[PDB]
Amino acid sequence: MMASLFSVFDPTSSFLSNWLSMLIPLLFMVMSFWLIPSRPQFLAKSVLMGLNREMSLLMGPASFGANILVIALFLFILFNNFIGLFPYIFTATSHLAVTLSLAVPLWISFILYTWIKETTNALAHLVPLGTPAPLMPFMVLMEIISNMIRPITLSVRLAANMIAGHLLLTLLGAQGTLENLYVTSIVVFSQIILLMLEFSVAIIQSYVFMTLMTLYASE
Amino acid sequence: CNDFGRRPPVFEDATKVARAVLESGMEFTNGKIVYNAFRSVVSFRTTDI
Amino acid sequence: SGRRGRHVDFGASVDFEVHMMRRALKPELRNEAIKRE
Amino acid sequence: QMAFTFAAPSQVFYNNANIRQVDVPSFSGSFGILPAHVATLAVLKPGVVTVYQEDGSTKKYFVSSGTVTVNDDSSVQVLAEEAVPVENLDLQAARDILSKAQSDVTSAGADMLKLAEGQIAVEVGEALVKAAEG
Amino acid sequence: DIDSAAKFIGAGAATVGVAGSGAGIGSVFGSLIIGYARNPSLKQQLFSYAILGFALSEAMGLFCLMMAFLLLFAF
Amino acid sequence: DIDSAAKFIGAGAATVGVAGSGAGIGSVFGSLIIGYARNPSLKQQLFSYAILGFALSEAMGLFCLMMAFLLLFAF
Amino acid sequence: DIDSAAKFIGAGAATVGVAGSGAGIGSVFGSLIIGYARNPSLKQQLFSYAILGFALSEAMGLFCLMMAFLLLFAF
Amino acid sequence: DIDSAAKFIGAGAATVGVAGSGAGIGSVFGSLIIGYARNPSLKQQLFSYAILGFALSEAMGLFCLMMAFLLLFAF
Amino acid sequence: DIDSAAKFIGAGAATVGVAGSGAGIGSVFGSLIIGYARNPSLKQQLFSYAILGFALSEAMGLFCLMMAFLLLFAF
Amino acid sequence: DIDSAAKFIGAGAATVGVAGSGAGIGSVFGSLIIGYARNPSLKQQLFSYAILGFALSEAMGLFCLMMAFLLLFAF
Amino acid sequence: DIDSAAKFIGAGAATVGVAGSGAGIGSVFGSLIIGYARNPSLKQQLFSYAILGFALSEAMGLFCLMMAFLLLFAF
Amino acid sequence: DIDSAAKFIGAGAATVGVAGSGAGIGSVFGSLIIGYARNPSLKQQLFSYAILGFALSEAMGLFCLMMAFLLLFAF
Predict the structure, then answer these.
(1) G53 by DSSP, 3-state: which?
(2) Are A127 and E51 in contact (CB under 8 A)?
(3) Shortest CA gap L74–chain D (Å)
(4) CB contacts < 8 A (F, K)
(5) Chains B and G physically touch (3 or more Cβ atom pairs below 8 Å)
(6) Beta strands D75-80; D32-33: pairing state
(7) CB atoms E40 and D30 under 8 Å
């Protein structure tokens, strides 16, 4: 009930810029040496092989070997949401260029490959199936607008979750005092509930974006 | 039940017994049916359903 | 329903349902299927 | 993988045969069955059970009553009172019984039980009219 | 100048009422999913009704667009 | 100028009330799909009752849109 | 002249309340379809309670539209 | 008259709570159609429960109607 | 007067949360009717969950009504 | 004050989403009654899903109450 | 000064309709839950129709969000 | 001042778009209880589809929340 603060998204606060905040997931990659794997390698391998099995129902021939790109997109999203919630790290996903890289090049990849391969089916995706003549043209124009700006909202969605998540945490932290045990315990317990929500949504947001890209690479 | 056996058993006679169990209103939770199973030509077994 | 509301057993409903089915078996199978008792 | 046990007191149709789809008219709604269906059971009503085997063959089996049970082991047990293929049925006979049923309804009067029997035969006659004319 | 500002509030207020078309379209396509879960052999009739359900709910949504357009440049 | 301005804000607010008709239409044609997916032989009276729901939901939607014009050109 | 201005905005915002009538009517006549699909032998009794649902929802909607007129000519 | 003007806008924005009465009455009485389509033997027990639901749902509509008058002739 | 106008507009805009409690009451009491038509012998615990549904849906309705007074008298 | 009025108007329009919590709670707790109408011996396991549904729906309630505080003391 | 200022008022009220898009998407996917407890064998075909239901539901929210961007800086 | 004042009003109007996300969340999680009640052996797969429903439900409300954050201290 005291105050608030913002602006945790400055890339050049120091001469060692915040581009190193994107080079942090390279550390967490499980580099493998031995034949029999270690504990975290087997955990990571079991998770990824689990996701590959689940996505195998939705792969299709046009994404015959593009599942590596989808899984790499999943791990990149997860390590840019999980690492964005740790305290003294600037919110990388808040910067739109990360979200620009997330949605725009892959959407252009999928829409141009669809247009070159199946041009009539791509235009038929802009119409609801079995649409009569008087119901045709307004559905076509709106779905043209829909399919043009749908990945832009995907980029907004990935940004907005971590922006709203980090704004909520900074709000709860700034409205607490160290000296007051009652306020500190309330603030800490409120953030723990909020972090459990924010950790859960971050994993689920990465899971749905893998599912959406697997569906849209199948076609 | 009586006057039975000369005619072949058909579903209507089964429904007559089925309606007899219902409309009598007698209380029953579990139960069984006693019949001669058809094991073979010369062997028949008495089981319960 | 109407059958339970009129207090008619489903077995009695079955016999009425099958008798009406059998009466629509005009060409050859009415006498062969109905063997009476 | 869907075991089918469509039998009847008169005839026997299928015995543990793999069927792609069977649509059943039940009192809980004229729903359909696919392999590994919902564990449930329901009561048959006058209508057209259809069989769509692994080859996609369409067969229509009108029944007059019965039972439908789907167990958790993908085992289908449909038992019906008198299951016949609908090709050996007459729409003219269906309307004749239907008109006879309408006469029973009109002549029932204070006989509420006979009124119910007229309603029951009306449902059977209307079911066969759609069955034979379709 | 005030008419310019009042048109902007009203045009924004006119686009409040497209949420109902958003919810109803999900309702008619949601009940398509349940209705096609059971009774799968009526796919053609069920999905044609889902199109009719969408064609009328978005028609109310385009009626919001018509009044939003009416309160943005027409009046 | 004030009167024309406030009528523009009011007509924008009156156009929200068509949202519920947008949700209602999407509701009634949703349950028509379920109602036709079970016992499809009653399509004649089902669609007769379903169009009764549509002719009442959208009528209340046009009731809001009629009142939107009354606060745009009548009053 | 702001009192007439406030009435125009208020009556516009009051008229949103007919949306709840719109969604309710589309709900009850939606569930009427499901009700008619399951045991249609009580058609007239079910339709009677459906009209009672309509006469208790749209009445509230036109109760709100009455308050819109009161906000233009009594308040 | 600005303070009275704000009260007219405030009451007008308070009568949107009737939309809560519309959806609740529509959903409850629609569900009554489904609940009376099957098991009509308890048609007096279910009807009594739905009228209880209708009364509580319509009470929220009267709560906002009171709040509209509470910003009208109470302060 | 200007800050008094803010309180009255803020209260009139914060009293729309009771519409959601009106819908939430209708959903639980609506589902109670369906849930009691099927297996009516579980009446006592069904009524308890319905009251539990009402005791959270209506209570979160008073969450906004508390904020209504927080924008009316307290702040 | 003008900016104090902007805070209050935003805060009143920040209490809108409390209606969404009431609808989300009423949907979950109502659907629990139907889900408990079958399997009365499955009380505790299904109760966990409903409280999960209640917690997430109420989390959206405090999510909207977040902007209520931000427009009351922060911005 | 009030031109772009009231454009920001309209833009906030224009992006309301994404809420109903969220309600619509939950309606489709919630009905997929009920539609998958029965008939798991139609997982792919039900999901593809549910995605089309989701796509048309999210298209409405983007339809409102594009209208919000139309009034933000697109003039 | 007045430009910033209308930025706060539009931010409040953008907070409207979170209620429907709470509605879609309550619809998925309510139907999850029904989905687990019917054939509880599919608990893990149905939970995955409902969680997928929650992924898109709150995200539609986050679009308006980001729009609220854009008009709070970003525009």
Answers:
(1) helix
(2) no
(3) 52
(4) 4
(5) no
(6) unpaired
(7) no
